[PDB]
Amino acid sequence: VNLDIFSNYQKYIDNEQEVRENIRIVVREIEHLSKEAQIKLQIIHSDLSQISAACGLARKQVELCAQKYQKLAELVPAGQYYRYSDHWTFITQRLIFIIALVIYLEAGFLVTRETVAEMLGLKISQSEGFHLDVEDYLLGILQLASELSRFATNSVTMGDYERSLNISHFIGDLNTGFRLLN
Amino acid sequence: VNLDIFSNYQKYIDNEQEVRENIRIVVREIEHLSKEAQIKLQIIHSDLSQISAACGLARKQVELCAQKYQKLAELVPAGQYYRYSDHWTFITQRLIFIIALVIYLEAGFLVTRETVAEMLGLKISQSEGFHLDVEDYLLGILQLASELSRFATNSVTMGDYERSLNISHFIGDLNTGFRLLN
Amino acid sequence: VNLDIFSNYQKYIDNEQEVRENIRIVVREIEHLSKEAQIKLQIIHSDLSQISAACGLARKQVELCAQKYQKLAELVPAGQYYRYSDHWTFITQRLIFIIALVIYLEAGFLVTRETVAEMLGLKISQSEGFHLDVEDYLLGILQLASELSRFATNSVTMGDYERSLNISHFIGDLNTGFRLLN
Amino acid sequence: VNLDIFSNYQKYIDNEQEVRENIRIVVREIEHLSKEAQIKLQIIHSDLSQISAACGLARKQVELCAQKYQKLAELVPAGQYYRYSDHWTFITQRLIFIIALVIYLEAGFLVTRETVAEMLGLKISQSEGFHLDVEDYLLGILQLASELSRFATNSVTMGDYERSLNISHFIGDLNTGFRLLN
Secondary structure, eight states, X not given: OOTHHHHTTXXXXXXXXXXXHHHHHHHHHHHHHHHHHHHHGGGGGTOGGGHHXXXXXXXXXXHHHHTHHHHHHHHSOTTOHHHHTHHHHHHHHHHHHHHHHHHHHHHSSOOOHHHXXXXXXXBSSTTTSSBOOHHHHHHHHXXXXXXXXXXXXXXXXXXXXXXXHHHHHHHHHHHHHHHTTO | OXXXXXXXXXXXXXXXXXXXXXXXXXXXXXXXXXXXXXXHGGGGGTOGGGHHHHHHHHHHHHHHTTTHHHHHHTTSOTTOHHHHGGGTHXXXXXXXXXXXXXXXXXXXXXXXXXXXXXXXXXXXXXXXXXXOOHHHHXXXXXXXXXXXXXXXXXXXXXXXXXXXXXHHHHXXXXXXXXXTTO | OOSSTTHHHHTHHHHHHHHHHHHHHHHHHXXXXXXXXXXXXXXXXXXXXXXXXXHHHHHHHHXXXXXXXXXXXXXXXXXXXXXXXXXXXXXXXXXXXHHHHHHHHHHSSOOOHHHHHHHHTOBSSTTTSSBOOHHHHHHHHHHHHHHHHHHHHHHHHTTOHHHHHHHHHHHHHHHHHHHTTO | OOTHHHHTTHHHHHHHHHHXXXXXXXXXXXXXXHHHHHHHGGGGGTOGXXXXXXXXXXXXXXXXXXXXXXXXXXXXXXTOHHHHTHHHHHHHHHHHHHHHHHHHHHHSSOOOHHHHHHHHTOBSSTTTSXXXXXXXXXXXXXXXXXXXXXXXXXXXXXXXXXHHHHXXXXXXXXXXXXXXXX
């Protein structure tokens, strides 16, 4: 029954505290930066002309927090990504989403994971460094379908019927895409 | 410490297990008749010509479980509707949904709470008898707007571009309706 | 699609926000008077001589919020007790607990539901008026058995071996009481 | 919009399925084995003489599933413990608990993490192999306090007062132990 065995877990528990503390800080920047991209991209729902303006704005915020993922990547020790990966999972997914929509609005195709990683400045695999997880990518893409679902509908409201129709096609391919999996 | 205020609670906790249980049996059937109505309504996504036949069979279930909500209404005592409502909330919502989908397919307008009641054999207000809550109505409709979002897409996949565009107008208007609520 | 069944629901959803909100204000105070009663009852763990003084101050809060359950009872309409009970369940349970701890410290026997009512200014049964549910009583007691488990230990830490042994007899009997329930 | 990008995630999603599948199988053995240790150790609450019999029984089950953790440890790839660590976290914690109680019943002191690891045949650190996590250890020990809380009380019921008193002392040291942390 030694307090001695609780004594030297005073230093571990204390240091883990402070690791999780800094991870939480950098992660909360990226949240804030992201959020302002996400808010601007909202305008597509009401002013159609604004797309180019919002995509350039989004694009710039992404690059602003590709830098933060650099700082984050060095606070994560060794091979212990999935110990803390909880703290940046949601954020990463919203970003995948943002990029995917930006690239759809620009060129009308689905961004590959590789590119999302490249734009964010992260790796394609576990091995060579702080990476971008397939499940995250897939879940971000999944948000996309739901967002364009809304956009297909506001396009009819803003009487751009032809566009609304295309959106629908694309969402169709995402759904077939997903059923390949289930 | 008296082992008797405990003896006179096991006779209550027993009695309650029975009420709660009989409530469960009835719902489990409503649970079952609706799932079959909803499973048939599935087809509208793949073979547009089945709409009529599907709407027939849905409308037949709905009334076959307006009857079950009968037996259910005579198992809830006094004014304890809300003490057990947890047991049939989600079930009711899905029905509102089915009915609402059904009338939409048929006449292309949004059902009123007032009718979903009539069709089910429930009262509009608490007073009168077993009733249909305004909150459960709106989440029923919230669900429809999501299911229509899907159909509007699959409509593009089956090449009924004209129809897809209509569903969107409607979804469009439902959103205006919800916005007016916060 | 009618934007008016939506206009006549915002007047309901408003009215409900108000009921729900005023229910919240009253509880938040009961929430506050109890936490202070419970925060004082803390001392029994560290300085056994304070028991009397603590029990005094607890018994003073309890009655100071038998009054608040007054104002609360005139905000719940009709027989919608269970529609809102979610707002005061956890609060009530902690009170039952405090009172039950209080009478135990004083006379060393288990209070009956019947008294916790009287002390609070609630009725035994649904009929009569705003009431004290049998389930909330038992979880109140379940809590006491956990809090006594602690005290029984701290009693060993302050060297009142005789007392520690008594608390255990009591906890012992409460378990027999609960076992008789499943 | 390529199905081609969903096509080659057919093989990853498929392989991860099957990894998680086998991890889930070995993990479910250890659950079953554990459980029967946990069930036998229950007798301490009623027949005091049985301790030696239960501790030997527990001890044998532990060694039986130190072997399974061997099989599990090779199904976990590379440095990806914390990817799957969710599947065996609870199980590990119950085991720490079991060992800790077995060693308390035998010799009356608190098992160090090192020993629990040694008995289970796992490592003390991240680095040199499949390991036993400090937080798990700590949470298992935490179960212990709650279990002995019950045991302190049944000892009074079986009129072994002197023992009940010791238990309480020990629980006291666990609590002081924990507050060093909070």
